[PDB]
Design a protein around this ligand. Structure first.
Ligand SMILES: NC(=O)c1ccc[n+]([C@@H]2O[C@H](COP(=O)([O-])OP(=O)(O)OC[C@H]3O[C@@H](n4cnc5c(N)ncnc54)[C@H](OP(=O)(O)O)[C@@H]3O)[C@@H](O)[C@H]2O)c1
Ligand SMILES: NC(=O)c1ccc[n+]([C@@H]2O[C@H](COP(=O)([O-])OP(=O)(O)OC[C@H]3O[C@@H](n4cnc5c(N)ncnc54)[C@H](OP(=O)(O)O)[C@@H]3O)[C@@H](O)[C@H]2O)c1
Ligand code: NA
Ligand code: NA
Lengths: 351, 351
């Protein structure tokens, strides 16, 4: 077989399309791998960038964008059926209408699930300077998940030396950093995760004081009392559901719950009830939700702290890396089954 | 018929006894009116007071004390089966072992459901000085409920001029004050209550901007959008249950929920689930429980503000007054049916 090159400079652009809006849990077959065509040229008048995508993030929030809604009651618009999935990634600039960015610069920000994207505005892109770390880190510890852990722990939890900290989904992109931040502060830290592998990772890689497999614990209250005989000062909440109900009676007086996520609720049409809210009164607890995008003014301050800590080996990170856009649908769905061990990354292209 | 006076100075002391611990909703027949005897003499060595009870408070928390528990996981010990109900009241000192208190002084604090009580310690009693108000006010606006409204609204809600405020159980002991405090601050204030009488009281007596009868609203979300077309900055939560679920999607960004009470949950063995907690994240809401007893250091500051406001007619109060200890069981149970119109008081004796 033989394929002539295009005399109009057309090349192939593989894409992951959302075929149609999703009800309940997403399936691989809700997405379609396709091959489009592109002339690698920016639209006339573009103030944006034409990029080659290198790495894509799989992030839990992305399921919410697969449900059809009008712009509102969500912080962000639905995906468009028939168009590529969009999400955070790391890309190389091919052409720019903004002279801040030149060919060969590396960026992170919202991009398409495709080999090549046009991003119409640069105002929400970050130009990468420090490349003495794996570039995939700018989807996790040096991107949106790392900023989430930094904001949620240091700005919402009011953490103090000697406090007790519980983290759910603790081996994941956000949780693995919260627990390290807490350990470095001098807190007692425990995490919950969904397998022996992830429990062992918490104790051995991340230095949590203890951890347990929630899927093997018939009695979550008894598990939390095993590790917190005098209660929990801070709950960093990533999951919601039965774990939140089990936590509430185990909070300390003036305890805090940072409500980062509620991933156990993301795929069911009607959420489970939280039943132990009386303990917010009895223990005088502050339960506070937050959105990372309200804290990006702190990003440069965050990088000034975390880059040298990674270099010094004070902070570490575990990524789950899968190869190719072809892998991306299964990697995204896998978040809701705990398939990922650490932060889920898709490698579209290393260069 | 003829009854000789006792040659040992014994007199009759009517009491309301808890016959046995309560499961589910309390009944009048869970309590027993009885006549004991007393020699109005303090025990040898007593550092406390012998008092004549004048007024008793019916307060929602009292149901929790009718369930048997070990000392813990509740901020206070169960009632004793076979002994008088205890709760906040207003009393006259007959005899004292503490010379701070003399015969004829008026106090408020925790006392027995009886004509005469021995209170073993004075450390938690307040000696009343200002008697140019109804003495019953020291069970409500000048007692524990008034302190609750002051602390919860001014210390937990971070209220600001022009903010939107929603109050549940808004015609009750606490809620009727929160809404007045909010109106005086320049907030837009709406309240929910369980009857037309109480709705009309909110608009006409307390100057709320609006109010509605939750028992007549099939769609609580639609009712809240009627009164809050741009959402709720502060929810002062007294009820929990379906009202909390309806509020959450109607919160404004950086909205606050002061969790004072959850009375819809007090009598059912398993609480209803709160299902809309995702909105704590989407709207970045602070949902914070508190206990009035952590704020009694502010009581003298509270009285310096509220006494002149009551005298000037800036603040008003509505009490539901029933006559006699014989009325007390039905008045207490009535709280869980909304029988009370305003703060529920029992008159044991006017002097
Ligand atoms: N507020 C914000 O701005 C913000 C930003 C970023 C992330 N978040 C939230 O933070 C949380 C963590 O995100 P992440 O990126 O770090 O994800 P992640 O932990 O790397 O991956 C998701 C993990 O969720 C766990 N999980 C999935 N379904 C579950 C269920 N039904 N019950 C309990 N655990 C379940 C799984 O771990 P196990 O194997 O341990 O079950 C899975 O590996 C998510 O809720 C996300 O939405 C919020
Ligand atoms: N955190 C603290 O330190 C503290 C201190 C004091 C009080 N509190 C709490 O504050 C709340 C109000 O106390 P309060 O003394 O002012 O009581 P209150 O409002 O004077 O009386 C209770 C009222 O609750 C309402 N209610 C009863 N069952 C209900 C249900 N199933 N659904 C909805 N509403 C229901 C009724 O009003 P409607 O006719 O309008 O239904 C009833 O009149 C209570 O939850 C109490 O426990 C907390
Ligand atoms: Na501690
Ligand atoms: Na407002």
């Amino acid at each position: 077989g033989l394929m002539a090159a295009s005399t109009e400079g057309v090349i192939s652009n593989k894409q992951v399309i959302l075929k149609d809006y999703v009800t309940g849990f997403p399936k691989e077959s809700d997405m379609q791998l396709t091959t489009a065509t592109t002339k690698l040229k920016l639209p006339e008048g573009s103030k944006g960038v034409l990029v080659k995508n290198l790495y894509l993030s799989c992030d839990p929030y992305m399921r919410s964008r697969m449900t059809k809604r009008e712009p509102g009651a969500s912080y962000v618009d639905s995906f468009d059926a028939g168009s590529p999935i969009v999400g955070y990634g790391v890309a190389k600039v091919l052409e720019s209408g903004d002279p801040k960015f030149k060919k060969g610069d590396l960026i992170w920000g919202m991009t398409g699930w495709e080999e090549y994207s046009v991003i119409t505005s640069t105002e929400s892109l970050f130009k990468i300077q420090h490349i003495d770390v794996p570039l995939s880190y700018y989807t996790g510890i040096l991107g949106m998940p790392g900023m989430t852990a930094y904001a949620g722990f240091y700005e919402i939890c009011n953490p103090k030396k000697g406090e007790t900290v519980f983290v759910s989904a603790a081996s994941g992109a956000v949780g693995q950093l919260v627990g390290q931040f807490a350990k470095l502060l001098g807190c007692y830290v425990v995490g919950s995760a969904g397998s022996k592998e992830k429990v062992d990772l918490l104790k051995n890689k991340f230095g949590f004081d203890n951890a347990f497999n929630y899927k093997e614990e018939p009695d979550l209250d008894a598990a939390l009392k095993r590790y917190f005989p005098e209660g929990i000062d801070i709950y960093f909440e990533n999951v919601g559901g039965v774990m939140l109900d089990a936590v509430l009676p185990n909070m300390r007086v003036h305890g805090r719950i940072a409500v980062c996520g509620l991933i156990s609720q993301y795929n069911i049409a009607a959420a489970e009830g939280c039943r132990n809210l009386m303990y917010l009164i009895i223990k005088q607890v502050r339960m506070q939700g937050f959105l990372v995008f309200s804290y990006y003014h702190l990003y440069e301050k965050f990088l000034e702290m975390v880059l040298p800590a990674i270099k010094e080996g004070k902070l570490t990170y575990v990524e789950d890396v899968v190869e190719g856009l072809e892998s991306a649908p299964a990697a995204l769905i896998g978040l809701y089954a705990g398939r990922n061990v650490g932060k889920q990354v898709v490698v579209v292209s290393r260069e």
